[PDB]
Design an enzyme around this catalytic site. Structure first.
Site: not given
Ligand SMILES: *[B@-]1(O)O[C@@H](C#N)c2ccccc21
Ligand SMILES: [Cl-]
Ligand code: NA
Ligand code: NA
Length: 261
Positions: A210, A43, A46, A139, A103
């Site tokens: 994450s 993420s 983003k 995503e 996120s």
């Molecule tokens: B990011 O890596 O993608 C989301 C998912 N699943 C998310 C949620 C919370 C923090 C970072 C991320």
């Protein structure tokens, strides 16, 4: 130096692969650890999607008000904001805020779609002078973080330099840069990562990530008390597909590299 030994020990203890790039804008110095290796951004990407939309809005200043339909068919695996707006619309500004502050994965997909797909976010990076960043998927699959897979990766060095350009430089116009920083300062998801390794008085705008393989990331612009700003990227990934997140490793890396500042 000594910081290098400390980061190596942290990496050893952690059991995974740690990537760090700190830029101290006081003297244009850097602290680098595996800073030219690739890591799955998850993420943290983003930021680049939202920045691409902000850049487009410089020449189409009504763009941020454009309404985007949120359908049940748009929902993916992490939709904290978008799920509340199903059957209505969100503006591109709202989607940017949702992607950066909560996120939200639907929001990310809408930003990606608007600018033309993952390759168009990559083209935006290239136009800035970042020849390392690559966004390749939407995503939720962009977070698989499989070892050896270059999709949806960048290096700590490249992401630190690009984040510096976006937040402290003039890659974006005055209004757009201020908007990116305001959004990142309002992130709700970062208190356990870089911020947890810094004094309470310091101001942080960050975006966490994450993903699979216990991938745990954070990128931040930092205003220390009475000092020029820092840029810090901490990327971390692990050998086991189902490894747990290790936000504490990012906090420890942040403490190591800012000790004395
Ligand atoms: B990011 O890596 O993608 C989301 C998912 N699943 C998310 C949620 C919370 C923090 C970072 C991320
Ligand atoms: Cl403190
Ligand atoms: Na990058
Ligand atoms: Na943080």
């Amino acid at each position: 130096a000594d910081v290098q030994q400390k980061l190596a020990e942290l990496e050893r203890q952690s059991g995974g692969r740690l990537g760090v790039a700190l830029i101290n804008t006081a003297d244009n110095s850097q602290i680098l650890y595996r800073a030219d290796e690739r890591f799955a951004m998850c993420s943290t990407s983003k930021v680049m999607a939202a920045a691409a939309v902000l850049k487009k809005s410089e020449s189409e200043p009504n763009l941020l008000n454009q309404r985007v339909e949120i359908k049940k068919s748009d929902l993916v695996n992490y939709n904290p904001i978008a799920e509340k707006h199903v059957n209505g619309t969100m503006s591109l500004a709202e989607l940017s805020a949702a992607a950066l502050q909560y996120s939200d994965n639907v929001a990310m997909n809408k930003l990606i779609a608007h600018v033309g797909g993952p390759a168009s976010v990559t083209a935006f990076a290239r136009q800035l002078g970042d020849e390392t960043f690559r966004l390749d998927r939407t995503e939720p699959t962009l977070n698989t973080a499989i070892p050896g897979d270059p999709r949806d990766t960048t290096s700590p060095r490249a992401m630190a330099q690009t984040l510096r350009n976006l937040t402290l430089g003039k890659a974006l116009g005055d209004s757009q840069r201020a908007q990116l920083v305001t959004w990142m300062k309002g992130n709700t998801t970062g208190a356990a990562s870089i911020q947890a390794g810094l004094p309470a008085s310091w101001v942080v705008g960050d975006k966490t990530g994450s993903g699979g393989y216990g991938t745990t990331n954070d990128i931040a612009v930092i205003w220390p008390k009475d000092r020029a700003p820092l840029i810090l990227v901490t990327y971390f990934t692990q050998p086991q597909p189902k490894a747990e997140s290790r936000r504490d490793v990012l906090a420890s890396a942040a403490k190591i590299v800012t000790d004395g500042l």
